[PDB]
Design an enzyme around this catalytic site. Structure first.
Site, short mmCIF file in Angstrom:
data_model
loop_
_atom_site.label_atom_id
_atom_site.label_comp_id
_atom_site.label_asym_id
_atom_site.label_seq_id
_atom_site.Cartn_x
_atom_site.Cartn_y
_atom_site.Cartn_z
N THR A 11 0.81 -1.11 0.00
CA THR A 11 0.00 0.00 0.00
C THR A 11 0.90 1.23 0.00
O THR A 11 1.96 1.39 0.65
CB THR A 11 -0.89 -0.04 1.25
OG1 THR A 11 -0.15 0.14 2.45
CG2 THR A 11 -1.58 -1.41 1.28
N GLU A 12 0.42 2.16 -0.84
CA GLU A 12 0.83 3.55 -0.92
C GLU A 12 2.35 3.65 -1.14
O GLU A 12 2.98 4.58 -0.64
CB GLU A 12 0.30 4.27 0.32
CG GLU A 12 0.80 5.63 0.73
CD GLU A 12 1.24 5.56 2.19
OE1 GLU A 12 1.56 4.39 2.55
OE2 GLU A 12 1.31 6.52 2.97
N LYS A 15 2.60 2.72 -6.64
CA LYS A 15 2.67 1.76 -7.72
C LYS A 15 2.23 2.35 -9.05
O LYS A 15 2.88 2.14 -10.08
CB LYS A 15 1.78 0.58 -7.35
CG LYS A 15 1.65 -0.41 -8.46
CD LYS A 15 0.84 -1.63 -8.03
CE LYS A 15 -0.61 -1.34 -7.70
NZ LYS A 15 -1.32 -2.59 -7.28
N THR A 16 1.11 3.05 -9.04
CA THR A 16 0.59 3.60 -10.31
C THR A 16 1.50 4.68 -10.84
O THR A 16 1.64 4.85 -12.06
CB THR A 16 -0.86 4.05 -10.13
OG1 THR A 16 -1.65 2.98 -9.63
CG2 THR A 16 -1.49 4.56 -11.43
N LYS A 37 -5.90 -2.30 -16.14
CA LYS A 37 -6.20 -2.50 -14.73
C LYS A 37 -7.53 -3.23 -14.69
O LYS A 37 -8.59 -2.60 -14.58
CB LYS A 37 -6.23 -1.21 -13.95
CG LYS A 37 -6.29 -1.40 -12.44
CD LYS A 37 -6.41 -0.06 -11.68
CE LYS A 37 -6.29 -0.31 -10.17
NZ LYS A 37 -4.88 -0.47 -9.74
N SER A 41 -10.98 -1.04 -7.28
CA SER A 41 -11.92 -0.64 -6.24
C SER A 41 -11.49 0.71 -5.67
O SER A 41 -10.34 1.09 -5.67
CB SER A 41 -12.15 -1.64 -5.17
OG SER A 41 -10.94 -1.77 -4.42
N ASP A 54 -6.68 5.36 -10.48
CA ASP A 54 -5.49 4.68 -11.00
C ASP A 54 -5.71 4.22 -12.44
O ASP A 54 -4.83 4.37 -13.29
CB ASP A 54 -5.14 3.50 -10.15
CG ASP A 54 -4.64 3.85 -8.73
OD1 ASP A 54 -4.15 4.97 -8.57
OD2 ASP A 54 -4.76 2.94 -7.87
N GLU A 115 -1.79 -3.74 -14.22
CA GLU A 115 -1.79 -3.47 -12.77
C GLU A 115 -2.96 -4.22 -12.12
O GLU A 115 -4.02 -4.33 -12.68
CB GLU A 115 -1.91 -1.99 -12.57
CG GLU A 115 -1.42 -1.33 -11.43
CD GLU A 115 -1.47 0.17 -11.40
OE1 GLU A 115 -2.50 0.63 -10.87
OE2 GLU A 115 -0.52 0.82 -11.75
#
EC number: 6.3.3.3
Lengths: 224, 224
Positions: A11-12, A15-16, A37, A41, A54, A115
């Site tokens: 998380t955070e 990645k994108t 992708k 969510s 994203d 992704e």
């Protein structure tokens, strides 16, 4: 042509951001690029339906002009594990649909970046994870490592499990998720030794990059 | 007697909170308990030398009155990977010293809880990780899972790698690191299905537990 799956250590880790840098570098190299992708969510309402930020970034960073649903066929509002919100919405996630969308992008793109919807073992149903699908597709994997405390452990865990699946760890990207710290160089050396894949580049700390300055320059695709 | 190694899914899942709950439950069951944190980084100066807060918690939650160095023989100030600060201080970390300290606690304790210095793959030198030592010692492992976004992936990665090392995943503890959220029950169900070890208990969100209220009651050692 080329296909890659991008996953993050946590998380955070941006990645994108890294996916967008990769896509930009591929366009600069002369590829016809697409981001994909399949599952998203955490999405906002629009007159056209839900849109995930994203997936929008991947769409905008594709060199082809792609329709949203082609980038992201499964869009859920709430930011929670796909299997949970899928079940709540009565909208099952089907491997074959995910695969068909990848094939559809390969009709037009010669360089596709995929992704996921969380980390490696993100459930899509109570019996299927995103790792299952990546494994079926035999995608080479690029790991995005946020340089922060805990990153060595998470990078090693994730790398080991990808290799154990029989998959190629194609490369890794270092993302500078905080301002420079003291042990930055030593952490980079450590990650570089331990991750069994080439370091493709390091993205500086961009305080969320509000001006959308170009990041492809940080990636050396020849190393991939 | 009994020995366990406790590891967390990530940074700041309250691993030491869970260790203290386990130790409290073991004392309530009638064991002579000791906590052991062979390696610690991030420590404060005192007239007696550096002291690490997690090691102090383990010391205080031991039923035996233990001297600090017996709980934590390697103490570094700065909060950074052991291999980095060890090298900077010229204070090498030796497996045999770590093992000798565990043996020393077994002279007096019949229930020993061991905590590391970061996650599973925490480097101790440029060629040795904390996982190497745990594997050598053949310790059964208890996983502490912070219930927060990303926890499913991290729990699964960590569980898989522990099992691949040939080690027993003895149990897991759920730590409520935030106030209650919406998907708490569904996340607990998911973790419970997927983690191949008994859920020993769930520790409520204690806003850092400033009054040091007892947490042993949340752990069912009979499930271990």
């Amino acid at each position: 042509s080329k296909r890659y799956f991008v996953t993050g250590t946590d998380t955070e880790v941006g990645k994108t951001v890294a996916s967008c840098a990769l896509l930009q570098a591929a366009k600069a190299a002369g590829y016809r690029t697409a981001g994909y992708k399949p599952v998203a969510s955490g999405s906002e309402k629009t007159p056209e339906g839900l849109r995930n930020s994203d997936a929008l970034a991947l769409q905008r960073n594709s060199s082809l002009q792609l329709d949203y649903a082609t980038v992201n066929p499964y869009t859920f509002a709430e930011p929670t594990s796909p299997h949970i919100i899928s079940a709540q919405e009565g909208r099952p996630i089907e491997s074959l649909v995910m695969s068909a969308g990848l094939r559809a992008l390969e009709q037009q793109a010669d360089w596709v970046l995929v992704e996921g919807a969380g980390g490696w073992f993100t459930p899509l149903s109570d019996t299927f994870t995103f790792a299952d699908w990546v494994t079926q597709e035999q995608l080479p994997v690029i790991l995005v490592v946020g340089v922060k405390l805990g990153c060595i452990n998470h990078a090693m865990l994730t790398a080991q499990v990808i290799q154990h699946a029989g998959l190629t760890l194609a490369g890794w990207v270092a993302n500078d998720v905080t301002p420079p710290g003291k042990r930055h160089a030593e952490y980079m050396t450590t990650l570089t030794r331990m991750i069994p894949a080439p370091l493709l580049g390091e993205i500086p700390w961009l305080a969320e990059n509000p001006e959308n300055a170009a990041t492809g320059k940080y990636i050396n695709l020849a190393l991939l």
